[PDB]
């Protein structure tokens, strides 16, 4: 997905596609780069699932949210980068057998964004 | 920048809030870092 601070640009290399599009024009804008790869500018006007058009037509539904969650998710992923990071509605961290130091690091990073789910 | 100059094993990054990170820092270095913490409220140790 692309859900991040509004206006995030993401490029995804794929197989050749005729075009790339979004079900709702407001939420996300789409352009083809190299004739195969996707370039998505997430306007993030609203939160919803999206349908994407190609030549092959494979659809990967994207849930889009504005970051006051997406930008915060990216920064936590970078700083922590066994841990798993998901966006959901609130940034969520999950893991099975993480070390106590990593848990302390995660709860320290908790202070940056109030709505985190550990 | 000023924190980097003053402290200059510790690593300094900007991110959104200035972040200090290190593995096996000596206790004196930690004390120095938390002392410089008063310079800017938004620091992540």
User: In terms of Cα–Cα distance, which of A80, A84, A118 is closest to A101?
Assistant: A80
Beta bridge partners of A116: A91
Residues of B with CB under 8 A from a CB of A: 15-17, 19, 21, 44-45
Elucidation technique: cryo-EM
* Minimal C-alpha gap between B7 and chain A (Å): 21
CA-based radius of gyration for chain B: 10
Resolution of this entry in Å? Answer: 2.4
Question: Which chain A residue is nearest to residue B23, measuring alpha carbons?
Answer: A101
How many Å apart are CA A44 and CA A4, to the nearest integer? 8
* Minimal C-alpha gap between B30 and chain A (Å): 16
Residues in chain A within 8 Å Cβ distance of B45: 108
Cβ atoms of A108 and A114 within 8 Å: the answer is: no
Q: What is the number of alpha carbons within 13 Å of residue B12 lying toward its C-beta?
A: 9
| Residue A91: how many other CB atoms lie within 10 Å | 26
Q: How far apart are the first and last CA of chain B?
A: 16
């Amino acid at each position: 997905t692309i859900d991040l601070y509004a206006g995030q640009v993401r490029v995804i290399p794929t197989k050749p596609v005729k075009r790339v599009a979004i079900g709702d024009g407001k939420v996300l804008s789409t352009t083809v780069v190299d004739g195969n790869e996707l370039l998505l500018l997430g306007d993030a006007e609203g939160e919803t699932s999206l349908r994407v058009w190609f030549k092959d037509g494979s659809e990967a539904a994207y849930r889009v949210l504005v970051a006051p969650v997406g930008r915060a998710a990216e920064e936590m992923r970078e700083l922590m980068g066994a841990k798993i990071r998901v966006v959901g509605d609130h940034v969520v961290v999950d893991g099975k057998n993480l070390a106590p130091t990593t848990l302390a690091r995660v709860r320290a990073l908790q202070a940056l964004y109030p709505k985190t789910i550990v």
